[PDB]
């Protein structure tokens, strides 16, 4: 299923994504969501994200509901509002979305405790892609990462299911990427999704 770079669909090059606004580029029915990020107490800006429903519908919908507050447990919404980025590796990726525990151990999806890997269509071919964190095959939950470089060694083990849109989005990713971290790559100052939703 994995596409080579020469066979990638229109709308997902870095240049194309950086020209993006608030509407999807890969397929017209893909949802666009956002995170407003705080670094410590300071507003860092907005990351807009196209979710590739056309290629990874389950993964896209899971992320979308966690952005909008539509997923509940016994009538209590849970999702990315207030979630942190707990693992940041310069020149590699930024990882977050553990709203369960805030430390990387958390796993919950809108489908249950976990959900299987969808088809591995897209490669980790550049910075600015959204991909699922996991604990091996068929263990997707709530965590994700945004690539800060090509990382094709992750291909066929993590589903690439979205892309950040526009220059501000990437600027925010770069800001997060370069914060000071401890020896375990945890930020010294918290990085939080203070608001999120659908555009």
């Amino acid at each position: 299923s994995l596409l080579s770079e020469s066979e990638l669909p229109a709308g997902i090059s870095y240049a194309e994504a950086m020209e993006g606004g608030s509407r999807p580029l890969l397929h017209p029915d893909n949802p666009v969501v956002f995170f407003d990020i705080s670094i410590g107490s300071h507003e860092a800006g907005r990351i807009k994200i196209e979710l590739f429903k056309n290629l990874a519908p389950k993964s896209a919908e899971n992320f979308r509901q966690f952005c909008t507050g539509e997923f509940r447990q016994n009538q209590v919404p849970i999702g990315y509002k207030g979630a942190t980025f707990h693992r940041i590796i310069k020149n590699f990726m930024i990882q977050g979305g553990d709203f369960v525990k805030g430390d990387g151990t958390g796993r919950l999806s809108i489908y249950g405790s976990s959900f299987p890997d969808e088809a591995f269509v897209l490669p980790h071919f550049r910075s600015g892609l959204l991909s699922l964190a996991n604990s091996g095959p068929d263990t997707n939950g709530c965590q994700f990462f945004i690539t800060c470089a090509k990382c094709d060694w992750l291909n066929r083990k993590h589903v690439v299911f979205g892309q950040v849109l526009g220059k501000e989005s990437m600027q925010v990713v770069r800001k997060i990427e370069h914060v000071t971290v401890d020896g375990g790559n945890r930020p010294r100052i918290p990085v939080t999704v203070t608001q999120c939703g659908e555009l």
Binding site: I89, G106, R107, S131, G141, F145, H158
Partner: peptide
């Protein structure tokens, strides 16, 4: 190494 796992980060 350079992985993205959820619980025990490996090399």
């Amino acid at each position: 190494x350079l992985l993205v796992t959820a619980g025990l980060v490996l090399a």
